[PDB]
Amino acid sequence: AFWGVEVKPGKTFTLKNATGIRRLHLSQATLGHGTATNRSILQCNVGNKSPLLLCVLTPDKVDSCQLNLEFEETDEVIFSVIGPRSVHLTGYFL
Amino acid sequence: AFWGVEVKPGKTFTLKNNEIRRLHLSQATLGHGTATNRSILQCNVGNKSPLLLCVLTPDKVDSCQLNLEFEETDEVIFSVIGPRSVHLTGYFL
Amino acid sequence: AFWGVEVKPGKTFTLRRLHLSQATLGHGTATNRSILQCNVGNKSPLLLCVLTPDKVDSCQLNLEFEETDEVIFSVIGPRSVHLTGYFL
Amino acid sequence: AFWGVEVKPGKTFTLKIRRLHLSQATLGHGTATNRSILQCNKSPLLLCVLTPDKVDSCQLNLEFEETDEVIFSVIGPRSVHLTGYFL
Amino acid sequence: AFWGVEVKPGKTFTLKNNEIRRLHLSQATLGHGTATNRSILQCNVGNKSPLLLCVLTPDKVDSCQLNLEFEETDEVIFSVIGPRSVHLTGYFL
């Protein structure tokens, strides 16, 4: 059931499917290790639709936060991180 | 299925349930900008008196959980009062 | 499904299963805190949350009610509290 | 469905009705500035810490049954209002 | 239903399913101590690379919601990096 991935500052995670589609519950975003003080923003693109901000993590202030989103899509979902430090996404499949 | 929209400052998003789904609103995140004044997320199902959903303060409370649910015949109008947009995210069912 | 009410400082609201999701501090310039209180019948009052202006302006509750008994929400403090949630 | 109890700074609460969902802990009335800790009982586990004028309430979202040990205690100067609902 | 364990600093707790239940991890609370450095909750499944679950900072963020669920064939290794323990609480099913 458990699911998780570290999305890195220049890299992107894509969630695709393979005729069946699983439903993923994204629960938590946690700031990764680093010394940089600038914030990291978690961003999401479904297809070509404009990107949506999921959360903002500020080192030593808001180091992790709840998301509780759910994904069961026919289009690929692209998570990206803008900022100096990676974001650990954790959750579970339904 | 995933759902989301960026509500710009001083603008309105309208949720229609015409052609019928139940939306779970999960998260509100402050958008990009340099302004330090707060943004308030507002909701009105009807021309009714608006109810406050949450307050986002730059560099203090940049996002917050909502966990509201909508399944209405009337339109639902979300609005943002403040200098920076609010990204609403959630999911159907 | 959506449900909500603004409980004014000097006022009480009286209430199948309602999921109370969110409490948000209302407009005003007062800096004193507001406390959300709940009286279910002759029972002693229980505190649901505390909102402090410019510090804790809203918070999750995630409570549920379906009560043959009358539920009375009240706010002690200078500013109103917007309660939001949903049925079922 | 609604459920709640004020656990006083020096008193223990036990559950004695359905599958209980503990949702919220709120600091009770008082002027004391010292922290209050909510504890559960076997070595006891901390559920949350509430600090006056800093963290006055917080989410829990745990599930209990009377079949369980279920011994809640509060260590600190101010009581803790536990609120939630039965399943 | 209730479940919980204190993961001591630098130590490991193992969630083992065999003989199979679904555990809902709800809450992480910082344990007793005077150290001001942060504690990080970490999760491994088998020999894969560890994922960060949450960060607890003394006197700032002393506890936080997790709402993770586990129902795996392999052991789950929780670990704490930092000076103070982390009390994990949750429930089965």
Q: In whole angstroms, what is the distance from residue E50 CA to residue E47 CA?
A: 9
Asked if A12 and A42 count as a contact pair (C-beta separation under 8 A), the reply is: no
Q: Which residues in chain C touch residue B55, judged by CB atoms under 8 angstroms apart?
A: 24-25, 57-58
Token pair listed for A21 = 């589609």
Sort strands D2-7 and D80-86 into parallel, antiparallel or unpaired: antiparallel
Q: What is the dihedral of CA C39, C43, C49, C53, to 10 degrees?
A: 50
Q: In whole angstroms, what is the distance from residue D38 CA to residue D50 CA?
A: 8
Q: In whole angstroms, what is the distance from residue C63 CA to residue C80 CA?
A: 19
Q: With an 8 Å Cβ cutoff, are B4 and A71 in contact? A: no
Q: With an 8 Å Cβ cutoff, are D1 and C56 in contact? A: no
Selected for mutation to probe chain E from A63, A65, A70 (highest E CB count within 10 Å) is: A63
Buried residues in C25-53 as b, exposed as e (16+ CB within 10 A): bbeeeeeebbbbbbbbeeeebbbbbbbbb
Token pair listed for E30 = 């910082």
Q: In whole angstroms, what is the distance from residue D21 CA to residue D54 CA?
A: 25
Q: Number of residue pairs across A and B with CB atoms under 8 Å?
A: 61
Asked if B77 and B44 count as a contact pair (C-beta separation under 8 A), the reply is: yes
Beta bridge partners of A85: none
Q: With an 8 Å Cβ cutoff, are D62 and E5 in contact? A: no
Query: Which residues on chain A place their C-beta less than 8 Å from a C-beta of chain E?
Result: 1-2, 4-6, 25, 27-28, 30-32, 60, 63-64, 66, 68, 88, 90-92
Q: Which residues contact C39 (CB under 8 A, 6 or more apart)?
A: C45, C46, C71, C72, C74
Q: With an 8 Å Cβ cutoff, are B61 and C60 in contact? A: no
User: How close, in Å, is residue D77 to chain C by CA atoms?
Assistant: 17
Query: Which residues on chain E place their C-beta less than 8 Å from a C-beta of chain A?
Result: 22, 38, 43, 45, 49, 51-55, 57, 61, 64-72, 76
| Number of domains making up chain B | 1
Q: In whole angstroms, what is the distance from residue D53 CA to residue D75 CA?
A: 18
DSSP E10-77: T-EEEE-------EEEEEEEE-S-S--S-EEEEEEETTSPPEEEEEEBTTTB-EEEEEEEE--SS-EE
User: How close, in Å, is residue A30 to chain E by CA atoms?
Assistant: 6
Token pair listed for B81 = 């009062």
Q: Which domain holds residue B38?
A: 1-93
The 3 state secondary structure assigned to C8-69 is CCCCEEECCCEEEEEEEECCCCCCCCEEEEEEECCCCCEEEEEEECCCECEEEEEEEECCCC
Amino acid at E80: V
Q: In whole angstroms, what is the distance from residue E18 CA to residue E1 CA?
A: 18
E80-E81-E83 Cα angle (round to 5): 100
Query: Which bin fits E59, alpha (ψ -120 to 50), beta or left (φ > 0)?
Result: left
User: How close, in Å, is residue D38 to chain E by CA atoms?
Assistant: 10
